[PDB]
């Protein structure tokens, strides 16, 4: 039978819209509130967030502080600019996330004029690292803002966290989510973690396809092959990229709103046409 209209006038009169970022599905305001809310007895002490976001083909990293007018960007790093340093492929894998995090850490320390005091981790062996405080200056402190992704063990976001830590930034964290951590053993396997930092897992999969499915290897890694990158040469590539990062870190096509006169004129034409009908 006829069904009562669910979205009547009364429904819209009492409807309260959520925040624009919430209904766009991009901001978790419960997490955001607890990330930026500073102690009131600290007054104007910025609370910096290490924002890491993954797109389908790029990694975005930013150091952000909150303000009434909006968020202020202290430093940013994109995986799409890593080719300037040597990394041409796999700009969204675990190794790329580590490189992006490392680049941001060196850039922010460069901007703060404290990169000489904190050089970061010089022996990347996959072990948990935290830059020790210097003599006359504490390390820059930032908080990881993972966003709406799932914080699973081995997630790329924690690969970027390791890169930021190795870059000399103080970021509160634990080792329970780095790649190689074991749920049962409750220990961090340095060898496995180091394997992911240099793309060892990517190299292992490339070799697996070659021996078993050479046809699949050509398509699944076409861009890797197109640039002469082999599975055994990935570790040397990333080690070269890391060294490079530390060395130097209007026509309108959319329609325009009609004016009042134009809209009224078109309305009259439709009105007359409807009246002239029948």
């Amino acid at each position: 039978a006829f069904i009562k209209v669910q979205k009547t006038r009364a429904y819209f009169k009492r409807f309260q819209v959520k925040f624009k970022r919430r209904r766009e599905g991009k901001t978790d305001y419960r997490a955001r509130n607890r990330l930026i809310n500073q102690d009131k007895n600290k007054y104007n002490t910025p609370k910096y967030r290490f924002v890491v976001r993954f797109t389908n083909k790029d990694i975005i990293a930013q150091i952000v502080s909150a303000s009434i007018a909006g968020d202020m960007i202290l430093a940013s790093a994109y995986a799409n600019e890593l080719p300037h340093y040597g990394l041409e492929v796999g700009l969204t894998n675990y190794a790329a996330a580590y490189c992006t995090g490392l680049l941001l850490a060196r850039r922010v320390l460069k901007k703060l004029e404290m990169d000489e005091e904190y050089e970061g981790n010089l022996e990347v062996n996959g072990e948990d690292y935290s830059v020790e405080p210097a003599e006359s200056r504490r390390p820059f402190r930032a908080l990881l803002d993972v966003g709406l992704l799932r914080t699973t063990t081995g997630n790329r976001v924690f690969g970027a966290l390791k890169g930021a830590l190795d870059g000399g930034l103080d970021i509160p964290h634990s080792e329970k989510r780095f790649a190689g951590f074991s749920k049962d053993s409750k220990q961090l396997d340095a060898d496995v973690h180091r394997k992911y930092i240099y793309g060892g897992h990517v190299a292992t999969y490339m070799q697996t396809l070659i021996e078993d499915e050479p046809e699949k290897y050509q398509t699944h890694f076409s861009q890797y092959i197109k640039k002469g990158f082999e599975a055994d040469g990935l570790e040397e590539m990333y080690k070269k990229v890391h060294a490079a990062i530390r060395a130097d870190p209007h026509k309108r096509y959319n329609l325009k709103k009609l004016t009042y006169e134009e809209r009224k004129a078109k309305l009259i034409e439709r009105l007359n046409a409807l009246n002239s009908a029948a």
Binding site: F15, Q16, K18, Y29, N33, N37, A66, S67, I68
Partner: peptide, 17 residues
């Protein structure tokens, strides 16, 4: 009325002396 739910974060960015 129609002002329930999440509290806007400008409340938490105020400075009090």
């Amino acid at each position: 009325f129609r002002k329930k739910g999440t509290i806007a974060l400008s409340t938490y960015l105020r400075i009090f002396k």
